[PDB]
């Protein structure tokens, strides 16, 4: 009933005295710790350290509350509050009651219209047809390194369509140089939090190759801008809106120190997480050969043309039913983290003081046998034929609410029409047995995931 029911205590894993629990996160796989810890504890538990205490949550039952937005709103966990030293105030790391948060909101929403979204579509396939391209262009036993490869399509990507600016990752045979400071930045970020003396001068390399990468990320938005000031443009992109928009509210654009903020923002928030999706969808798909061959014979039968139209991307039903999929069992941005507006009182049993923080921990979530049965760990994306029979806030993955994901049709889209394309030129092995290693650079990607894709030899 109403409150009938008594104050619950609030499970917590060992502690260590003054640290808490910080030394539990001595891994480079806290999101997939945390994990176990909750299989361990289940629906709720308390996790502290110095200057820190917030609640994870792994049901729907409290995630239902907590996305409740009369109740919370949007929360930096740390992980943000350390990434926000290299994305400012832009976007992601911002709070919702932040003035550059709202005006940067406003201007730039209109980038992520259905109007816009229709513009996108031949950027895609540009850089589709070139990933296709390279892997037509493969020796017999030659392989592909799936992240690397996903990643050289979400960037180039994410660069051309927001920045019209070529990145030409398909032209080099490493990871391009941002991608590869972007990768230490975040790693540091991760490491940031696992540190219990931040000015032990062992960090003191660390801190330097920190700026160092900081300005090569930098040097590339420089460049990115010198390249638009220099030219007339056909763009109406991301780009020009930074740059040109007004907010509706004051009148005022962006000014200079948040744009490049947004920019560094968007080229990572726009490829990183969807290459992991396609990493990991491409995993599943090899994992479980006869779910590829219906996604496979969708493909044949629905992108009839060269390349794809904006139309059939969006009658590969089955293809979105596989992205969906595996986004429930690795959700590439893996939590979110929310606060309390009031004092208040979650789930009936667990009382909460006005400020206190709650994180939402997304592959608990998505593994709620409550929800989606017993076979949870099972990769079938027939879950996803009925969207009424998943609960709200059961599924997750674009977080919620005012500050959910902006870029989501973006992604889906992107994602749909590349692994659509795939699935029509490719027959694909498993020829390793590769054994899942998830990554986590702050976002999860399965590490050294390798494939040999057999042409089907249709022309493009
Ligand atoms: C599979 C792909 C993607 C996933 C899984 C994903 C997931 C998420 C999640 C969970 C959040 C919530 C963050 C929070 O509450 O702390 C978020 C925010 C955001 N995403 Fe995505 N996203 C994806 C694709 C994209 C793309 C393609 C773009 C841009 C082209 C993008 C841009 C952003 C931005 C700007 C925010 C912050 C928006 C705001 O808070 O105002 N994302 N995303």
């Known amino acids: 009933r109403g409150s009938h029911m008594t104050i619950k205590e609030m499970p917590q894993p060992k502690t260590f005295g003054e640290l808490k629990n910080l030394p539990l996160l001595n891994t480079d796989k806290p999101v997939q710790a945390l994990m176990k810890i909750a299989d361990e504890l289940g629906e709720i538990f308390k996790f502290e350290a110095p200057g820190l205490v917030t609640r994870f949550l792994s049901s729907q039952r409290l995630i239902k509350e907590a996305c409740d937005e009369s109740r919370f709103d949007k929360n930096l966990s740390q992980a943000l509050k350390f ?23 406003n201007i730039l929403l209109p980038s992520f219209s259905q109007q816009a979204m229709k ?38 990507t994410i660069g051309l369509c927001g920045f019209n600016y070529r990145f030409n990752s398909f032209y080099r045979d490493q990871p391009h140089p941002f991608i ?3 990768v230490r930045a975040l790693d540091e970020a991760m490491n940031k939090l ?8 062992a960090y003191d390399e660390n801190k330097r190759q920190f700026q160092e990468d900081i300005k090569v990320m930098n040097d590339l938005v420089d460049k990115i801008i010198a390249d638009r000031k220099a030219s007339g443009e056909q763009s109406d992109d991301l780009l020009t809106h930074m740059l040109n928009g007004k907010d509706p509210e004051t009148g005022e654009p962006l000014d200079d120190e948040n744009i490049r903020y947004q920019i560094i923002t968007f080229l ?17 798909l090899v994992k479980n050969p006869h779910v590829l061959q219906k996604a496979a014979e969708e493909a044949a039968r629905v992108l009839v043309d060269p390349v794809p139209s904006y139309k059939q991307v969006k009658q590969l039903k089955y293809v979105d039913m596989v992205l969906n999929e595996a986004l429930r069992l690795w959700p590439t941005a893996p939590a979110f983290s929310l606060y309390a507006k009031e004092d208040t009182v ?8 006005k400020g206190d923080e709650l994180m939402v ?22 879950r996803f034929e009925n969207p009424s029979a998943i609960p709200q806030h059961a599924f997750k993955p674009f977080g919620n609410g005012q500050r959910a994901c902006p870029g989501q049709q973006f992604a889906l889209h992107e994602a749909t029409l590349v692994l659509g394309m795939m699935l029509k030129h490719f027959d694909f092995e498993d020829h390793t047995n590769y ?21 089907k030899k249709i022309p493009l």
Not at 84 to 103: C, I, M, P, Q, Y
Not at 131 to 145: G, P
Not at 368 to 375: C, E, L, N, R, V
């Open 119 to 156: 513009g996108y579509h031949a950027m895609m396939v540009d850089i589709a047809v070139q990933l296709v391209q390279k892997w037509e262009r493969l020796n017999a036993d030659e392989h592909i390194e799936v992240p690397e490869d996903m990643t050289r399509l979400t960037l180039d």
């Open 435 to 455: 054994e899942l290693d998830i990554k986590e650079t702050l976002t999860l990607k399965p590490e050294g995931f390798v494939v040999k894709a057999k042409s």
């Open 83 to 105: 990434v926000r030293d290299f994305a400012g105030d832009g976007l992601v790391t911002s709070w919702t009651h932040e003035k550059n948060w709202k005006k940067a909101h």
């Open 361 to 382: 921990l997304i592959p608990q979530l998505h593994r709620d046998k409550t929800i989606w049965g017993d076979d949870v760990e099972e990769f079938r994306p027939e």
């Open 346 to 353: 979650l789930g009936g049993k667990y009382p909460l003081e």
């Open 268 to 284: 990572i928030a726009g490829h990183v997480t969807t290459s992991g999706l396609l990493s990991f969808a491409l995993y599943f």
């Open 194 to 201: 696992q540190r219990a003396n931040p000015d032990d001068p």
């Open 180 to 182: 590869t400071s972007m």
